[PDB]
Design a protein around this motif. Structure first.
Motif, PDB file in Angstrom:
ATOM      1  N   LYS B 227       0.850  -1.182   0.000  1.00 19.62           N
ATOM      2  CA  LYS B 227       0.000   0.000   0.000  1.00 19.62           C
ATOM      3  C   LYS B 227       0.888   1.236   0.000  1.00 19.62           C
ATOM      4  O   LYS B 227       1.964   1.229   0.608  1.00 19.62           O
ATOM      5  CB  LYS B 227      -0.931   0.010   1.217  1.00 19.62           C
ATOM      6  N   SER B 240      -3.062   0.933  -3.698  1.00 19.28           N
ATOM      7  CA  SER B 240      -2.730  -0.471  -3.495  1.00 19.28           C
ATOM      8  C   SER B 240      -1.997  -1.019  -4.711  1.00 19.28           C
ATOM      9  O   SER B 240      -2.427  -0.807  -5.851  1.00 19.28           O
ATOM     10  CB  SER B 240      -3.991  -1.298  -3.232  1.00 19.28           C
ATOM     11  N   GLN B 247      -7.688   3.119  -3.208  1.00 17.89           N
ATOM     12  CA  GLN B 247      -8.673   2.382  -2.425  1.00 17.89           C
ATOM     13  C   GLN B 247      -9.461   3.268  -1.469  1.00 17.89           C
ATOM     14  O   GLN B 247     -10.685   3.135  -1.381  1.00 17.89           O
ATOM     15  CB  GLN B 247      -7.987   1.263  -1.632  1.00 17.89           C
ATOM     16  N   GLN B 248      -8.791   4.168  -0.752  1.00 10.93           N
ATOM     17  CA  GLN B 248      -9.433   4.923   0.315  1.00 10.93           C
ATOM     18  C   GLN B 248      -8.743   6.269   0.478  1.00 10.93           C
ATOM     19  O   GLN B 248      -7.547   6.409   0.208  1.00 10.93           O
ATOM     20  CB  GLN B 248      -9.393   4.147   1.639  1.00 10.93           C
TER      21      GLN B 248
END
Lengths: 140, 600, 493, 471
Positions: B227, B240, B247-248
């Motif tokens: 990550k 990622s 992803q976030q």
RNA sequence: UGCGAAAGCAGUUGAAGACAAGUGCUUGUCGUUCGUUAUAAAUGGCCUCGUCAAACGGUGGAGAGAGUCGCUAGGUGAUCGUCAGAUCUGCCUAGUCUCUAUACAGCGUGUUUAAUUGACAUGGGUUGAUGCGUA
């Protein structure tokens, strides 16, 4: 079939001459049932108190385990063996308080004592009925 | 999770390049090979001073130092122990640049100087990897060239990524196979991401992607377990591998208040989904999976603390929760002095137990349906109540009950709407301020029956009510979450028999036996003695409370003479209990010749 | 339609100290024969080959006992002074023996008359003489001279190798399986010395400190070696050279130790250890060497042995006592015209296309009480409960089944004092037990509520109630006490 | 079933049929088959008919047909028990039938407790549907819409004999709860055995817990362990929660009482059997059937909702975390965490979503208008279900009346996202939906009182060829 | 019947119509209605397909039985009797001590975590039923 029946109260996996302390310590350490049995044959309460008095606190715990198994298997020994148990708790009470775990190591006592007490309400019900009929034909 | 106090490793030299505290971190390089969980040694490259190796424990000490000319800046430095042609050796690889005119790549071999070699690098060396197994030194250049050398600095292979101005290069290994990725800025906030596999050519490109909206000038980058973490404008962006897909994005409001330019920020990962964030002299340990601040520490004695590197735990596999991180601390004063410091870090257990109640992010009943079947404005209320004159009970009751349309002086299931806690607290504050002495409004009686009575007002609630008899029995019976300690103090202080039985019933119902036993150990020996005397003078709840007392008192404390009186009482009770039980069970439960007169 | 369920026997919750599968196997060594010898039986060994006869060394003679007959079949009395070993070789053809004079005699097993080889190992006593397991020709000897010579059968004039370095008596010698070069010896120094015969030897490669005089050393597995000395036995790992486990459950000093593996017991491997306190106990190497069974004898045990893994017949447990007693425990293991007329029964349809099987397997015969319940004979089923020689558990079930069926009064209507006493007799004894106390309370309640009048006119029924009231009153005391010990036991915790 | 031979007045028997014989008939030109209708009078809530076609030659079931066999909490619609010689719990007398019908209609109209919710389970490994029939489990395959097994899981007089007259008053053991581990290789069952009446021990119910195992290929569950009177004597087990995959690789479970006690059991390989690993004391004197239990997926924390109070207890110490306590307006019916962050707590007056991270309630929805006293404690839990990925569902059922309440019902399903911010979907079904639960896929299965399982989810040669076949 | 915990706390079990029997009157009944949350008993009990012997693998046990005037602690009886005690070398209960096919109960060995084989022509007829054995 061959399933195991069990209960929810089984917390297993969670001064005077004539004292037999020397024999008792050897019997408990080596798990010699015959040697242990001779020690439990003494019934003089004065002896029982003194032997447990001089017995090492570490060995007292396993003595409670041995008595519990004997009481559970044989109900007729419940009386004579209890005085051993009562004196073990009285004398080694302070040591027993300061142990990391009691339920796992004394699980045998808790199961055995729990079983007898649970019958207590029923036996009173039977006793009252037996007295009622016993009183009736005795007066008649 | 916890953060230990920093302890000094060394004092940085007073060099002009290091005088700029904002750029100080970039001038100090940390060897990846020597800095891990199990290594007690740290190799450091200080621009213009030397490249030094220190032993951390038991006490910090200097073990080896290589001087460097003060005009040189260390761009990349690595150190790894291994066997070379077999003797156990320590290979040191570091690169320097000299006024941007010439670039030096250097490898030093030490016996555990055996040899020293130097070559001219084409572009700035950013990342250096030492492969002791194959006896290779791999250098990544800013112009995109990845050059593989032996320990003699003979060029074996050269790979070009077809992109220049390379800005980020980090190493990682997966499943025993050796990998590397690099990020190259492009125009219009675009970034080419490429993942490379190290194995005819020893370098194989696995992925190549262009990332849009990825800025570097105000972005701090760090990598952990596939990550990529990018902090920008108080937001942490999660990419990622192997495709570096977003992803976030995590919002960190504590950074949103930072004015742009004065606040010094550094970022490093300390475990899986756990990082270290610094803002000037304050150190934060954050859990990003749950978005919680595991720990916080402020270094009052230093102006700023910048993270350089951290030893990262693989908590999924490692039972050890303790690690160390390194940073540069700058002292307050007219002559600031910079020092290198080490901080011991407890990451924790990586469980939700750790992150509960520690979020760094800061109601009205709603109908279930928006719209022939069988049926089975708080602030304005506060404003009206506050405006009343003091000690005006009738008006205060009228406004509260009428305006909320309450019909009863006790809570009912139809008052669910009023359950908003903020409103109740303000009403309670008014009742305290508006009324004092012996007269309280009927609103208080209703609130005492409310299941959501605030916990903050439970303490001393009995103490405020000691005037009025009726307000006890409402509070004792129904007031929620009343503290046990106050009940026990009132239990052993009150002589009124009725209150004792109700208090005994309340205590047992709402508290566990062990919880009560601990408190009674605190109660004075006289008070328990007085209670025992009360006994010798619904009953099971009072006796069961007695059996708890004897457990709290213990064997040593109890006195023989009183024990005699208590024993006689119990024996009498046992006989009575036996007698009554027998009654209860009882409630549940031809002759050859006969002489008779005939009726005619 | 479904087959009738079988009546399920009542099983109360498990009590402490239940019988374990390991215990059930070892209780089967029931038949015990106690033989008396002239002096202490110092060593006992088993022939590795069929029929697995075992030899016992006692006084100045060696006796071989037949496995099946459990009686002496051969006697080796040529020895003038005391004997100290009877170990067989791996082939089982030869058995060697040491002597207090120090001479080592190799005889042909089962042929006492012939002596194959005679070696004067030392002038001191030769206590241990053991054939090498992997190699047949080389024979090991340890003597009070404290040098453990390795002899070769072909060359008996000089030892092949003469290991030294022991500062005390060496009475223990062991060969590690899968490591023919390695040899293990334990002396009363408390040190276990390991030697490498491939190298020059005479100096141990390393020593393991036991801290007490070592009485016997056994190699349980290729990497694990168990040594018994002093009041405990410790298991060492050679790869790490440290003791994995230690068990000091014994009272007196452990003397002998034997290991058997891959035998038909539930436990794959067993470790039997003599105690010198009269105890020989079994340990499980798979479970951290925990005790699983034990025996007690009249006096101290000097030698213990168990039949090898491939006994091929009745197994044997042998214990050797210093008084000279030998204790043996054993686990025992028409016309042609008519046939030609009836010749198809053996065929199982091996060559046929379709094999069709409908025979229902035979269920065990049902007992009388079960048949009566199945036929709805409520009163007769009650009678079968109280019959002589009826198991206590089986008596409880029929009483529980009848209650579960709702037939408690139904079974008790047509009865008088003559046929009521068997139930009351059981109730008098069943009230004592915890398991049957609850059932007794229900049944006794009904008979009172159903036979109050008959009780008045029957004196024998009354007396059953007087003693029953005495016994239930006694149970009240026991149950009340159990509450008190429970009450104080809460105080401690 | 008795075949009377009228020539000699003899008879032949076919006993131990699955139920009492409502109807019997000979079906065939030569009487090849016998057709039977079986009733299964054990389930009082509904009349469970099964059609059995037997081969007359050997009296073996040629074809046994029956639908799902749920046990609803209370009798539904116009279900009436069959006529017997006496009026008992499983039957009606000659006189009692009409009065029972009138009483049933009056109960359905006038009364306010209208709970017919039934317990159902889903097998993770196989996705078969398990119905806890009284004293037995019916394993039913809804993909094929056919029964796959019927197993007796309790002791008692279940198929030993046919109860008649007073024997028909006996109550067989009732399987109150039935649950599976996440792995699906272990089955946990909770049983209540009722003593026979008119004895000293006629009021002491026996509580049993059983652990069963089977391999996937097998079809019968084998009882491995049996605990008699868990938690003590005469103390029920209100709630059962199998453990997550994180702890003991899904070989554990918790049982919760009405006294607030918790017991954690696990499968110990060395002992080879299930043993009580951890215990919590139900010592305090507060009783309530409203008990709910949830477990975090990581296994670190356990949420125990007893009466009005929720507790966060750490698994390691098995005690309150060191805010742990949450007070609620009314009794807790079900506690469920849609995601590790969000915990959704339903009380008797509302439902709320709370962030464990913030400890602040996000959304609250009123339930009092629909659920006031309709359901007994714990059944709203089997009404509310949650996916582990997308979101949860609330099911609300209303009586329909036009101008006093009428028998027919209408059900409304509402799909809610995590934290209940938005209603993803809103559907209406025309019948009382007894139970809705989440199949391990995205789809949700729901059961109707009509025993209907719906789902809510995202040339010369040619001429000669014909004629030859005809011949 | 309502609520609740399982314990329990409150509250019910009415009126009309018709029929049968006995003597307009009495009782009992209801494949009759309205309203309220609201003993039994027609002599009437569950099929067959394969049994017996000997083993083996787990699961339980109060162990199934026989001795030992060997110990420990109790209870208690016959007769006599100078109330201290005698003869029955008294009896019984429990524990301990010695022993044996764990001898006792139960599930399985169609594949299972583990664990089997062997015998029989599974027929018909005659005699004995005051059967056979035992006191």
């Amino acid at each position: 079939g061959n399933a195991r029946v069990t209960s929810g109260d089984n917390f297993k996996h969670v001064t005077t001459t004539g004292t037999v302390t020397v024999i008792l310590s050897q019997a408990l350490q080596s798990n010699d049932h015959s040697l242990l049995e001779t020690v439990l044959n003494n019934r003089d309460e004065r002896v029982i108190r003194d032997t447990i008095f001089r017995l090492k606190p570490a060995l007292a715990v396993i003595l409670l385990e041995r008595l519990a198994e004997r009481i559970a298997r044989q109900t007729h020994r419940q009386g004579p063996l209890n005085v051993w148990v009562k004196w073990c708790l009285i004398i080694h009470g302070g040591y027993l308080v300061s142990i990391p775990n009691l339920m796992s190591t004394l699980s045998s006592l808790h199961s055995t004592l729990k079983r007898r007490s649970d019958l207590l309400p029923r036996l009173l019900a039977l006793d009252a009925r037996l007295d009622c009929t016993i009183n009736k034909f005795k007066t008649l | 999770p916890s953060l230990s106090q920093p302890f000094r490793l060394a004092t940085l030299p007073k060099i002009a390049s290091l005088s700029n505290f904002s750029l100080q971190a970039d001038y100090v390089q940390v060897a990846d090979g020597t800095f891990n969980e199990s290594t007690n040694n740290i190799t450091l490259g200080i621009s213009g001073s030397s490249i030094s190796q220190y032993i951390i424990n038991p006490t910090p000490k200097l073990t080896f130092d290589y001087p460097i000319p003060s005009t040189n800046i260390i761009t990349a430095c690595n150190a790894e122990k291994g066997q070379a042609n077999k003797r156990n050796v320590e290979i040191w690889a570091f690169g320097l640049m000299v006024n941007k005119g010439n670039y030096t790549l250097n490898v030093i071999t030490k016996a555990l100087f055996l040899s020293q070699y130097k070559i001219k690098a084409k572009a700035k060396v950013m990342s250096i990897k030492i492969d002791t197994k194959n006896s290779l030194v791999i250098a990544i250049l800013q112009n995109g060239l990845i050059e593989i050398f032996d320990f003699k600095l003979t060029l074996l292979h050269s790979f070009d990524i077809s992109y220049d101005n390379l800005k980020y290069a980090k190493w990682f290994t997966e499943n025993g196979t050796e990998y590397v990725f690099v990020l190259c800025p492009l125009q219009d906030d675009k970034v080419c991401y490429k993942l490379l596999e190290l194995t005819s050519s020893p370098i194989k490109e696995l992925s190549s992607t262009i990332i849009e909206g990825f800025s570097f000038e105000n972005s701090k980058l760090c990598y952990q377990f596939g990550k990529l973490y990018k902090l920008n404008q108080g937001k942490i962006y999660i990419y990622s591998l192997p495709h570096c897909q977003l992803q976030q994005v995590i919002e960190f409001p504590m950074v949103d208040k930072l004015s742009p330019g004065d606040d010094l920020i550094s970022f490093q990962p300390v475990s899986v989904n756990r990082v270290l964030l610094t803002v000037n002299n304050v150190i934060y340990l954050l859990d990003l999976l749950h978005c919680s601040t595991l720990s916080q520490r402020e270094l009052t004695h230093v102006k700023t603390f910048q993270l350089l590197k951290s030893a990262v735990i693989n908590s999924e596999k490692s039972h050890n929760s303790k690690t160390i991180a390194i940073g540069i601390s700058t002292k307050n004063g007219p002559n600031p002095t910079s020092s290198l410091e080490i901080i011991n870090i407890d990451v924790g257990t990586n469980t939700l137990k750790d992150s509960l109640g520690k979020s760094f992010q800061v109601v009205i009943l709603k109908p279930l349906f928006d719209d022939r079947v069988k049926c089975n404005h708080c602030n304005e209320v506060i404003e009206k109540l506050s405006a009343l004159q003091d000690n005006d009970i009738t008006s205060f009751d009228d406004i509260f009950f009428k305006e909320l349309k309450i019909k009863e002086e006790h809570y009912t299931e139809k008052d669910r709407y009023i359950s908003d806690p903020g409103f109740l607290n303000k009403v309670l504050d008014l009742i305290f301020g508006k009324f004092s002495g012996n007269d309280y409004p009927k609103t208080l009686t209703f609130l005492l029956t409310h299941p959501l009575f605030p916990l903050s007002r439970t303490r001393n609630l009995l103490s405020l009510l000691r005037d009025q008899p009726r307000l006890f029995k409402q509070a004792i019976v129904t007031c929620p979450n009343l503290p046990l300690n106050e009940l026990l103090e009132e239990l052993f202080s009150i002589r009124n028999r009725e209150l004792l039985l109700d208090i005994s019933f309340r205590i047992l119902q709402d508290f566990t036996r062990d919880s009560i036993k601990q408190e009674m150990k605190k109660l004075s020996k006289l008070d328990v003695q007085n209670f025992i005397e009360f006994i010798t003078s619904q009953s099971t709840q009072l006796f069961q409370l007695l059996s708890l007392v004897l457990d709290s008192i213990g064997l040593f404390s109890l006195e023989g003479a009183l024990l005699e009186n208590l024993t006689l009482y119990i024996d009498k009770q046992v006989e009575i209990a036996e007698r009554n039980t027998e009654l209860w069970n009882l409630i549940d439960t031809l002759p050859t010749y006969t002489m008779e007169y005939l009726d005619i | 339609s479904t087959a009738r369920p079988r009546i399920i026997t009542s099983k109360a919750p498990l009590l402490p100290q239940q019988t374990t599968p390991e215990q059930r196997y070892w209780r089967q060594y029931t038949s015990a024969q106690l033989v008396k010898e002239h002096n202490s039986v110092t060593h006992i060994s088993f022939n590795p080959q069929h029929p697995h006869d075992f030899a016992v060394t006692s006084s100045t003679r060696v006796q071989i006992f037949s496995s099946r007959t459990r009686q002496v079949i051969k006697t080796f009395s040529r020895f003038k002074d005391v004997v100290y070993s009877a170990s067989f070789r791996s082939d089982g053809k030869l058995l060697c023996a040491g002597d207090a004079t120090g001479l080592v005699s190799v005889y042909d097993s089962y042929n006492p008359r012939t002596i194959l080889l005679s070696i004067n190992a030392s002038t001191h006593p030769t206590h241990v003489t053991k054939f090498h397991t992997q190699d047949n020709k080389i024979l090991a000897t340890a003597s009070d001279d404290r040098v453990t010579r390795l002899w070769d059968i072909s060359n008996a004039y000089e030892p092949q190798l003469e290991l030294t370095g022991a500062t005390d008596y060496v009475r223990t010698l062991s060969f590690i399986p899968a490591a023919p070069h390695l040899v293990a010896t334990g002396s009363y120094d408390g040190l276990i010395r390991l030697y490498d015969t491939r190298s020059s030897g005479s100096t141990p490669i390393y020593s393991l400190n036991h801290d007490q005089p070592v009485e016997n050393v056994i190699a349980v597995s290729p990497t694990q070696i168990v040594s018994c000395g002093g009041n405990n036995f410790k298991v060492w790992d050679l790869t790490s050279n440290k003791k994995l486990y230690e068990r000091g459950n014994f009272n007196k000093a452990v003397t002998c130790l034997d290991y058997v593996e891959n035998f038909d017991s539930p436990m794959q491997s067993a470790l039997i250890a003599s105690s010198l306190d009269g105890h020989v106990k079994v340990f499980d190497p798979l479970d951290n060497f925990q005790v699983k069974f034990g025996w007690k004898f009249s006096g101290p045990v000097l030698s213990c042995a168990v039949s090898p893994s491939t006994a091929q017949g009745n197994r044997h447990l042998v214990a050797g006592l210093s008084s000279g007693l030998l204790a043996i425990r054993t686990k025992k293991k028409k016309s042609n015209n008519f046939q030609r007329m009836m010749r198809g029964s053996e065929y199982q349809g091996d060559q046929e296309h379709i094999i069709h099987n409908d025979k229902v397997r035979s269920q065990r015969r049902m007992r009388a009480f079960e048949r009566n319940i199945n036929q709805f004979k409520w009163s007769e089923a009650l009678d079968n409960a109280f019959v002589p020689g009826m198991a206590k558990e089986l008596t409880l079930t029929v009483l529980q089944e009848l209650r579960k069926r709702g037939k408690v009064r139904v079974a008790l209507y047509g009865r008088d004092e003559s046929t009521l006493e068997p139930l009351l007799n059981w109730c008098l004894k069943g009230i004592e037990d915890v398991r049957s106390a609850s059932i007794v309370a229900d049944w006794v309640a009904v008979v009172l509520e159903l036979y109050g009048n008959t009780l008045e006119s029957s004196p024998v029924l009354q007396e059953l109630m007087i003693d029953l009231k005495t016994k239930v009153r006694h149970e009240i005391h026991k149950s009340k006490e159990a509450q008190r010990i429970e009450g104080m036991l809460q105080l401690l915790t | 079933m008795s075949l009377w031979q009228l020539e000699t007045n003899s008879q032949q028997f076919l006993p131990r049929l699955n139920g009492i014989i409502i109807d019997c008939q000979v079906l065939g030109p030569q009487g090849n088959y016998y057709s039977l209708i079986l009733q299964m009078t054990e389930n009082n809530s509904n009349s469970d008919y099964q059609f059995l076609l037997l081969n007359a030659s050997d009296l073996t079931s040629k074809l046994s047909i029956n639908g799902p066999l749920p046990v609803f909490n209370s009798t539904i619609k116009h279900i009436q028990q069959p006529i017997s010689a006496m009026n008992t719990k499983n039957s009606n007398s000659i006189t009692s039938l009409n009065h029972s019908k009138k009483k049933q209609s009056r109960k359905l109209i006038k009364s306010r407790r209208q709970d017919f919710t039934t317990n159902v389970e889903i097998n993770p490994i196989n996705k078969n549907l398990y119905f806890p029939h009284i004293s037995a489990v019916q394993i039913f395959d809804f993909y094929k819409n056919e029964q796959v097994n019927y197993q007796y899981l309790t002791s008692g007089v279940n198929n030993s004999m046919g109860k008649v007259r007073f024997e028909l008053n006996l109550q067989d053991p009732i399987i109150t709860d039935l649950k599976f581990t996440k792995d699906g290789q272990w089955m946990i069952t909770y049983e209540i055995e009722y003593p026979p009446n008119d004895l000293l021990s006629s009021k002491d119910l026996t509580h049993i817990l059983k652990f069963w195992t089977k391999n996937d290929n097998e079809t019968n569950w084998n009882l491995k362990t049996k605990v008699i009177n868990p938690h003590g004597i005469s103390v029920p087990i209100t709630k059962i929660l199998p453990s997550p995959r994180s702890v003991n690789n899904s070989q554990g479970c918790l049982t919760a009482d009405n006294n607030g006690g918790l017991k954690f059991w696990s499968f110990d390989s060395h002992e080879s059997n299930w043993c009580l690993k951890k215990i919590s004391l139900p010592n305090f004197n507060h009783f309530s059937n409203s008990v709910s239990l949830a477990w975090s997926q990581d296994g670190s924390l356990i949420f125990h909702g007893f009466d009005d109070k929720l507790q966060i207890l750490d698994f390691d110490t098995f005690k309150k975390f060191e805010v742990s306590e949450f007070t609620l307006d009314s009794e807790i019916q079900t506690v469920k965490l849609i995601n590790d962050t969000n915990l959704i707590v339903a009380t008797r007056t509302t439902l709320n979503a709370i962030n464990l991270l913030r400890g602040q309630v996000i959304n609250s929805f009123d339930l009092y208008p629909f659920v006031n006293g309709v359901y007994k404690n714990g059944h709203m839990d089997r009404l509310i279900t949650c996916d582990e990925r997308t979101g949860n569902i609330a099911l609300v059922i209303n009586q329909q009346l036009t101008d006093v309440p009428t028998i027919n019902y209408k059900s409304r399903i509402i799909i809610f996202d995590s934290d209940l911010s938005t209603k993803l979907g809103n559907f209406t079904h025309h019948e009382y939906i007894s139970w809705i639960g989440w199949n391990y896929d995205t789809d949700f299965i729901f059961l109707d009182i009509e025993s209907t399982l719906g789902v809510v989810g995202t040339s010369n040669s040619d001429i000669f060829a014909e004629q030859l076949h005809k011949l």
